[PDB]
Every structure is written in C-alpha cells, then in structure tokens.
Design a protein around this motif. Sequence first.
Motif, PDB file in Angstrom:
ATOM      1  N   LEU A 126       0.826  -1.189   0.000  1.00 18.18           N
ATOM      2  CA  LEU A 126       0.000   0.000   0.000  1.00 18.18           C
ATOM      3  C   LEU A 126       0.865   1.245   0.000  1.00 18.18           C
ATOM      4  O   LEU A 126       0.492   2.258  -0.591  1.00 18.18           O
ATOM      5  N   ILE A 127       2.015   1.179   0.667  1.00 16.09           N
ATOM      6  CA  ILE A 127       2.948   2.306   0.631  1.00 16.09           C
ATOM      7  C   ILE A 127       3.477   2.524  -0.782  1.00 16.09           C
ATOM      8  O   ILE A 127       3.577   3.655  -1.248  1.00 16.09           O
ATOM      9  N   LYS A 128       3.810   1.433  -1.460  1.00 15.75           N
ATOM     10  CA  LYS A 128       4.378   1.501  -2.804  1.00 15.75           C
ATOM     11  C   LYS A 128       3.384   2.037  -3.849  1.00 15.75           C
ATOM     12  O   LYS A 128       3.734   2.201  -5.018  1.00 15.75           O
ATOM     13  N   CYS A 129       2.135   2.237  -3.436  1.00 14.24           N
ATOM     14  CA  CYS A 129       1.132   2.931  -4.243  1.00 14.24           C
ATOM     15  C   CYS A 129       0.964   4.381  -3.834  1.00 14.24           C
ATOM     16  O   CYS A 129       0.048   5.054  -4.298  1.00 14.24           O
ATOM     17  N   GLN A 130       1.810   4.825  -2.912  1.00  9.31           N
ATOM     18  CA  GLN A 130       1.778   6.191  -2.400  1.00  9.31           C
ATOM     19  C   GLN A 130       0.483   6.504  -1.689  1.00  9.31           C
ATOM     20  O   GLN A 130       0.028   7.647  -1.682  1.00  9.31           O
ATOM     21  N   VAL A 131      -0.099   5.480  -1.078  1.00  9.66           N
ATOM     22  CA  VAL A 131      -1.305   5.650  -0.284  1.00  9.66           C
ATOM     23  C   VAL A 131      -0.932   5.685   1.188  1.00  9.66           C
ATOM     24  O   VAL A 131      -0.622   4.649   1.774  1.00  9.66           O
ATOM     25  N   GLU A 132      -0.968   6.853   1.812  1.00 12.36           N
ATOM     26  CA  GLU A 132      -0.545   6.881   3.198  1.00 12.36           C
ATOM     27  C   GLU A 132      -1.715   7.067   4.122  1.00 12.36           C
ATOM     28  O   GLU A 132      -2.205   8.175   4.334  1.00 12.36           O
ATOM     29  N   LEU A 133      -2.102   5.961   4.730  1.00 15.79           N
ATOM     30  CA  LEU A 133      -3.195   5.941   5.664  1.00 15.79           C
ATOM     31  C   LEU A 133      -2.613   5.308   6.904  1.00 15.79           C
ATOM     32  O   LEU A 133      -2.097   4.190   6.847  1.00 15.79           O
ATOM     33  N   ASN A 134      -2.661   6.012   8.021  1.00 16.91           N
ATOM     34  CA  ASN A 134      -2.145   5.441   9.246  1.00 16.91           C
ATOM     35  C   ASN A 134      -2.986   4.244   9.657  1.00 16.91           C
ATOM     36  O   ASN A 134      -4.126   4.094   9.230  1.00 16.91           O
ATOM     37  N   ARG A 135      -2.418   3.394  10.487  1.00 16.57           N
ATOM     38  CA  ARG A 135      -3.092   2.180  10.888  1.00 16.57           C
ATOM     39  C   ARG A 135      -4.419   2.401  11.613  1.00 16.57           C
ATOM     40  O   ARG A 135      -5.309   1.561  11.514  1.00 16.57           O
ATOM     41  N   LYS A 136      -4.563   3.514  12.324  1.00 12.09           N
ATOM     42  CA  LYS A 136      -5.834   3.855  12.974  1.00 12.09           C
ATOM     43  C   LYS A 136      -6.984   3.817  11.973  1.00 12.09           C
ATOM     44  O   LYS A 136      -7.927   3.000  12.065  1.00 12.09           O
ATOM     45  N   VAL A 137      -6.875   4.706  10.999  1.00  8.68           N
ATOM     46  CA  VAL A 137      -7.807   4.786   9.895  1.00  8.68           C
ATOM     47  C   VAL A 137      -7.978   3.474   9.122  1.00  8.68           C
ATOM     48  O   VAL A 137      -9.095   3.118   8.751  1.00  8.68           O
ATOM     49  N   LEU A 138      -6.895   2.739   8.904  1.00  9.13           N
ATOM     50  CA  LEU A 138      -7.003   1.491   8.167  1.00  9.13           C
ATOM     51  C   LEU A 138      -7.847   0.470   8.918  1.00  9.13           C
ATOM     52  O   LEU A 138      -8.674  -0.219   8.316  1.00  9.13           O
ATOM     53  N   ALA A 139      -7.649   0.373  10.230  1.00  3.46           N
ATOM     54  CA  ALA A 139      -8.462  -0.519  11.061  1.00  3.46           C
ATOM     55  C   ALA A 139      -9.934  -0.121  11.021  1.00  3.46           C
ATOM     56  O   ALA A 139     -10.827  -0.978  10.902  1.00  3.46           O
ATOM     57  N   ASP A 140     -10.191   1.181  11.110  1.00  7.16           N
ATOM     58  CA  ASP A 140     -11.578   1.641  11.074  1.00  7.16           C
ATOM     59  C   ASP A 140     -12.253   1.354   9.742  1.00  7.16           C
ATOM     60  O   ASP A 140     -13.440   1.043   9.701  1.00  7.16           O
ATOM     61  N   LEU A 141     -11.508   1.472   8.652  1.00  8.37           N
ATOM     62  CA  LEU A 141     -12.043   1.050   7.368  1.00  8.37           C
ATOM     63  C   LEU A 141     -12.363  -0.434   7.403  1.00  8.37           C
ATOM     64  O   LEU A 141     -13.444  -0.843   6.996  1.00  8.37           O
ATOM     65  N   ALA A 142     -11.427  -1.237   7.901  1.00  6.88           N
ATOM     66  CA  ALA A 142     -11.619  -2.687   7.953  1.00  6.88           C
ATOM     67  C   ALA A 142     -12.901  -3.084   8.675  1.00  6.88           C
ATOM     68  O   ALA A 142     -13.599  -4.001   8.250  1.00  6.88           O
ATOM     69  N   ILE A 143     -13.203  -2.400   9.770  1.00  8.65           N
ATOM     70  CA  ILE A 143     -14.448  -2.661  10.481  1.00  8.65           C
ATOM     71  C   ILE A 143     -15.656  -2.044   9.800  1.00  8.65           C
ATOM     72  O   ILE A 143     -16.604  -2.739   9.456  1.00  8.65           O
ATOM     73  N   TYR A 144     -15.643  -0.729   9.653  1.00  8.69           N
ATOM     74  CA  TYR A 144     -16.836  -0.020   9.238  1.00  8.69           C
ATOM     75  C   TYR A 144     -16.997   0.197   7.739  1.00  8.69           C
ATOM     76  O   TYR A 144     -18.007   0.746   7.307  1.00  8.69           O
ATOM     77  N   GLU A 145     -16.015  -0.200   6.940  1.00  7.47           N
ATOM     78  CA  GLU A 145     -16.138  -0.039   5.492  1.00  7.47           C
ATOM     79  C   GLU A 145     -15.622  -1.232   4.713  1.00  7.47           C
ATOM     80  O   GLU A 145     -14.714  -1.083   3.905  1.00  7.47           O
ATOM     81  N   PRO A 146     -16.217  -2.410   4.927  1.00 12.68           N
ATOM     82  CA  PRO A 146     -15.634  -3.644   4.395  1.00 12.68           C
ATOM     83  C   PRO A 146     -15.387  -3.603   2.888  1.00 12.68           C
ATOM     84  O   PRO A 146     -14.421  -4.216   2.423  1.00 12.68           O
ATOM     85  N   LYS A 147     -16.220  -2.873   2.145  1.00 19.23           N
ATOM     86  CA  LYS A 147     -16.035  -2.738   0.699  1.00 19.23           C
ATOM     87  C   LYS A 147     -14.745  -2.026   0.316  1.00 19.23           C
ATOM     88  O   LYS A 147     -13.901  -2.577  -0.396  1.00 19.23           O
ATOM     89  N   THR A 148     -14.611  -0.791   0.788  1.00 18.42           N
ATOM     90  CA  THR A 148     -13.443   0.036   0.505  1.00 18.42           C
ATOM     91  C   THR A 148     -12.187  -0.703   0.924  1.00 18.42           C
ATOM     92  O   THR A 148     -11.146  -0.622   0.273  1.00 18.42           O
ATOM     93  N   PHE A 149     -12.297  -1.457   2.005  1.00 18.76           N
ATOM     94  CA  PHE A 149     -11.155  -2.205   2.465  1.00 18.76           C
ATOM     95  C   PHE A 149     -10.828  -3.334   1.501  1.00 18.76           C
ATOM     96  O   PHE A 149      -9.655  -3.582   1.226  1.00 18.76           O
ATOM     97  N   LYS A 150     -11.839  -4.026   0.988  1.00 21.18           N
ATOM     98  CA  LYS A 150     -11.545  -5.068   0.010  1.00 21.18           C
ATOM     99  C   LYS A 150     -10.907  -4.458  -1.234  1.00 21.18           C
ATOM    100  O   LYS A 150     -10.070  -5.089  -1.879  1.00 21.18           O
TER     101      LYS A 150
END
Lengths: 140, 71, 148, 108, 97, 59, 40, 155
Positions: free
Chosen positions: A81-105
Amino acid sequence: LRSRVTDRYWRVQEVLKHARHFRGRKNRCYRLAVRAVTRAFVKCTRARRLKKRSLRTLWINRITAASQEHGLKYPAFIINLIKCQVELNRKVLADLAIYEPKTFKSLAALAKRRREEGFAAALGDGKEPDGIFSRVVQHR
Amino acid sequence: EKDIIKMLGLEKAHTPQVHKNIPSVNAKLKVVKHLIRIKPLKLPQGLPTEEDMANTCLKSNGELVVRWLLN
Amino acid sequence: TARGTASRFLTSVLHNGLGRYVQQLQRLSFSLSRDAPSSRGAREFVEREVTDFARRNPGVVIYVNPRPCCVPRVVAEYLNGAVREESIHCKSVEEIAALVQKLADQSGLDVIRIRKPFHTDSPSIQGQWHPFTNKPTTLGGLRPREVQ
Amino acid sequence: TYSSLPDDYNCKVELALTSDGRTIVCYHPSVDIPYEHTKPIPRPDPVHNIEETHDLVLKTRLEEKGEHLEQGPMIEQLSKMFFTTKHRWYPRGQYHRRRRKPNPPKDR
Amino acid sequence: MTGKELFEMWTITNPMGLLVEELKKRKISAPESRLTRQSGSTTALPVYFVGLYCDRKLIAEGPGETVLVAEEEAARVALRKLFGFTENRRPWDYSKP
Amino acid sequence: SSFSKAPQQWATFARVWYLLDGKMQPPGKLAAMASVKLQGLHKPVYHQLSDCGDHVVIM
Amino acid sequence: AGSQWRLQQGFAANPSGYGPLTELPDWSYADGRPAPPMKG
Amino acid sequence: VPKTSLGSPPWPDIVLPDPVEETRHHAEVVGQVNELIAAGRYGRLFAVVHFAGHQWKVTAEDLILIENELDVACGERIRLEKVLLVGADNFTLLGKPLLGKELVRVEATVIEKTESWPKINMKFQKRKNYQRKRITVNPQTVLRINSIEIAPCLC
Ligand SMILES: [Mg+2]
Ligand SMILES: [Mg+2]
C-alpha cells in the motif's frame, strides 16, 4: 508566638479524594492512602505513554484479521500500500476494515495487484515495463 | 568522540549538518566515522541566490533543491 | 485519574453547529468591591473591556454587582443549565479578559475525561463487518459435511 | 476481465487509474446472494398439548411447565448451554455490586 | 432526527404485511423468505440471516436470533430501502438558497 | 447496511463454528489456526475484553 | 514502515518530512481567504 | 518437462493484462464512476482527512476533537484541505497521497473552544526522595464537520 496548622483537614482531603475507590484500609488512612495515591499517579503517567503502543498493536491485529480474510498477509498489504503512495495510518485502516468492508476489500485488491506487479518486474529483468500501479507520481 | 561529535554540530541525531570537505574537518570526521553517515551535497539547480533562500529544501538523496513548491 | 473520575462521550448540546451555531454561554455575573485591592483587575476590566465584550457578544447578559466582597468571582451560566464558578481574585485585566473568553467559547458540558475524540451517528456507511460479510456462499447452502 | 480477488463474495471490485495518474478510483457495487445458493426456511409448528375431551384443559396443559434445581447442577447446566466455565455464574460480594456505575455513559 | 431510525419513530407492528401492500402498489408480487446464512441451530445463541426474494432477485436481508425475528428484520430492511429511509441515504441539506 | 440496532449488534458479534480436518496434519500447525480462531483474532472487531471467539471442531 | 522504498524514490524516509502531506496549509476559511500560517 | 515437489515454485502463476487494454479499461471505468458523480447517485460520503497532525475518518454531521488551539472564531466554517480518501457505498477515490482540491471539498464548523480535563503527570524514584507532580491542561477545539461535497470532474 505559637503557630499551629489550622487547615490540616483540607490538606488531607486533597490526598483522600483520589483514594476513595481503593480497596482495604488504603481508602481511609492518610499514611497508607498517600502512598497508594502516589503509586496510582505514577502508574497512571507510565500508562499514558503505554496506551499509545497498546492501541497501535490493537490496530495492527485488526488490520491483520481484515487482510488475512482476503488471503493477504499483513506486511505485504501494508508495504504494497505504501508503494502505491497511499498513506493511511493504521488507525484509519483498522476503522475502514471494520466499518467499510467494501473500501477495504478494494485497498486489499490494490495492494495485491501492486505486489504481483512487483514480482512481475523483478522476474522480468528489464527496465521497459512499468506496471500501471507501479508508477511513481510527483507533487504538483 | 563525545567532544568531536559536539564540535561538529552533530549533537542531535538524524539531523543533517553541512561541512567543508577540507582536511581539517576530515580529520575529526575520521575519528567518529562509525557514529555518522556522510553523503556528498549535490546542487542540480546550483547554489541559491538571495531570492531563493526561502524556497530552499534538502532532499534525502542528499540534493539541495532551490525552488520548492511553485504555485 | 481516569478510573478515579467520571467520564463522557464527545457531544454537542442540541446538535450545535449542524443547522446553525448558537453561542452556548447565556449569562455572566461579576461580583467585585469598589474598595478592596483584591478586586483591582476586575474593576479595570469592568471599566474598559466589559462594554466592548457586551457588543461582541449580543446573546449573553452581563450582570455587574459592586458589593463588599473579599474575593471577586465570575459566575458563567449556560443554556445547558450548567453553572460554572470562577474566581477573578487578584488577576490582571489581561488575565480576566482571557478567562472571560474561555467562558464565552465553552459548551457548558462538564469537563471530564472524554472517552474518544470523535462522535458519529452512522459511522458505518456501506456496511458494518460481521463474520459472514467476507465469506463465500455455497451451492444449495449446504454446511461442510452436509449431504443432500 | 481481471480482478486480483475473486468476486464470489462481498463486492465485485474494479480498479482504475486516472489518466492523469494522480488518483486511483475503485468501483465496488454489492454482490447479492444468488437464489440457487439458499435453502428454504425451516418451518416447525406442532401442538399435541390438546386433549380431545377437555380443551380448556388443553390450553392449561401448555401452562403446566416449570421446575427447580440446586445451585451446583443449575450452574453446570447453564455453563453447558453457553459453553462457559462454571465460574462466571457465581454471585459477587457486596463490595463489587456497590461499585458498578449506576448510569453508564451511552454512545450512539 | 439525526442518528434516529425510521422504525424507531414509526412503531408499526407487522412489517411483512406492510411490505406486501407496498409491493402490490409497486406491481411486484410475492416476497419469499429464503434462509441465507446461519450459525448454530442447536446453540442457545444462533444467528440467522434471512433474505427476501422477488422473482429470484434479492431485495433485502436481515439477521436475528430466531428465523422469525430475522424474517421480520428482512422485512424492515426492505421497507427501509423502498421508502428511501436508509443509512447510506443523502444526509439532510443545511444551506442558504 | 440498514438493520435495527439489536440485530446489527447481534450479527456482528455472532459466534461461528469452524470445522478443521486433522488427518495427516502436524498437531502444531493445527493448533496454530485453532488458537487464532479460538481467541477470535480473525475478526476485525477483535478486542481482548469482548468475548469474541469461535467454536472450533477438530476431527 | 517501508522507509527503504521511500528513500529509493527520493522522498523522505518518514512521510512526515517535507512532503506535500506536511507542507501544505491543511485548512482555509470557507470564503477562500487563506488561514494564518502554521507554527511548524 | 518433469515434475518434482520443488522444480515448480509453490504459488499460483500470475498473468497481468496487456498495458494497452488496461489503459482502455481504466478510462472506461473512470468514465462510469464519473457518470455516477454527475448524476448525484452517490448516497452519503465519508472522507479520510489529514488535519492537525492526525488522520480522521469523517462523515457529514459528525464531531471531532482536536487536541490543540486553532485560530478561528466559534461558528466559522473551514475547508479541510488535505483529503486522502473519499468514499461512498458504490465507489472510492484514493489520493496519491492527496486528492485535487477540485475533486472534493469538505467543510467543517468549529463549535467549541475549550480546555482538556486535568491530566496528572507524576515522576517518582525509589529511595531517592524525588517526586514531581505536575498538572497538565491542554487547550481543545471541537469541530462539527458539516458537508462533504464531491465535484464531477475526474479523468
Ligand atoms: Mg510523546
Ligand atoms: Mg514539536
């Protein structure tokens, strides 16, 4: 001129209010109480520094669950994900994983794609191919 | 070595500092060379004029860019 | 300490700032002494600043009482019903001004530990993970060893 | 016709890169569960509590259920139901009941 | 009305019936309750996901402890989609025309 | 996404039963995934003070 | 992590350094007037 | 062509589509999403936003608590500029690492300026006779984020 301490009462309360919810004699007796309260503050600040580590570890465990679901281990997911220049801290990434299963997939799809691209380029042994997602953009 | 590090301005870690490549300096650097990372300064856009002082930035490849973030 | 004291979630009173913003501070009451030195700053503040403050904030009613007191106080009072007491005792004009500003911009909610920095109703847009959300469905919907 | 992950579950995922290069867009519509992948609702209703002779006796026969056990075996049964260990079900002293907050904070 | 549901304030007691009437109005026929996901039937804490199908398309779906509860849920969900009272729905407009 | 509160919460923290075949497997590699699934560490909603953990049946 | 890659690509090893992520003025008034600059 | 446990790498072989068909496919998809935006068919947006040194997952009508002072009157509306992620039920826009200001605009109001509850900080050392106790109070700012709007322009 004799001077005695008149207000000693309040002096004690400022310790004892912090001790109310303790178990045993620590919650009454000024001697025991004082020591216990001090230990409680010290433990408290140390824990204030610790809390941040704990939370970050939590987030990592959750992100790992989320990734593993999609058949992608944690390190791969994160660095690709870093190598795509997408910088999302782990806080936000975890919250996506829980509350946004689509965007996370989606994110997981991206990472997986970028990884495969990387292997493709490393095995290919030439400078010519640039994978679509392996391109590195500069600021404008 | 503690003293050499102090007098090289290297007190704070992971902060860059710039020094002449003259022998006077190279001597001290030689003493502490296991405590440091040394990389040559590069100037693609050349040395900064006085109009360019505010816009200067130092990139990790060790190169000094004069015009930073136009419009 | 956090286990020691009470706590609350992050909220606004009456969903402030959603439709429109309503300054939550309602009234402000000063009590000071014309004579006593302790109240000196508070007097100067009443001279110069209060007036201007009152124009800058039309919605707050400001009651000034000279009375024989040793300890000048300012009582902030909020739409929330919340009453917050303060002592302007022995302070500058500058200090008091800053204080009155803090009072002006506060929600009137209780100041305690706030459990988490964000508050969302419907955090979940597009779904909320459950054990089945990422699992594939099978044909006939059979269980692992189930036969048909 | 390529995605990095199978479209079997969750969403069908499309990954596009803006012509500029400076934005990634993902199209992900939900994937609904196909009819052929489901099984019919189990339907169970049977009333045998009926006595042909007296049916207000029959309606009183469904009200005829109750029982009482001892502490120990009650707890064993309880902990077999929910797959817990026995310990959870025992009471707790005055001191612990008294420090439960009367009114816990509520989110949402 | 922020954060609130539909059926939080509406209070209607038979979601299935109401759904059938609304689908008569839309000229769609017969919602069929079809069991989708389940975990443990023999447990004291089962989970059911009941889907609702109209001509083998899936209109809406819901969870519950019991298959009945869940069916009722799928009804409420379907209702909420039809009426456009939804989570994903456009948040209200606060603006100065 | 639109569920009532109770069924939503119930669906999220729902228990699940996994089946794991053991034949010709090292008990260690078995116990690894068994352990993960027991602690509920495969759930993005995981926390140590939530009861979340799932049943595992090894045969 | 991933500082090594970030270095090969000529960015800062830490995303916090000097990128457009940090440098840019993260807020502005709704009208469009610029915000007072940032201490950092 | 023999087959041993090893001679074949233990992982699925990969085939990545030809770059040309891919560029076509991408332009096509972008076209589709862009239509979805222009039509107003997205329901409700969330956006991951970098602000005050932190990242947040934000949505209309919500609340965030910033741990330091901002210079703004109470009631001011503010455009949070750095936007990493935008999302909606059917699609998501990702930044590299940022979205163009023309692509998305999120406005938040500052509701409340305040200060943090008192945080005790205590240093201690066994039998050195050294305690220090200091009470910290941090200035705080509560933002209500108002609206996430997203403009049709995408390429
Ligand atoms: Mg720190
Ligand atoms: Mg600093």
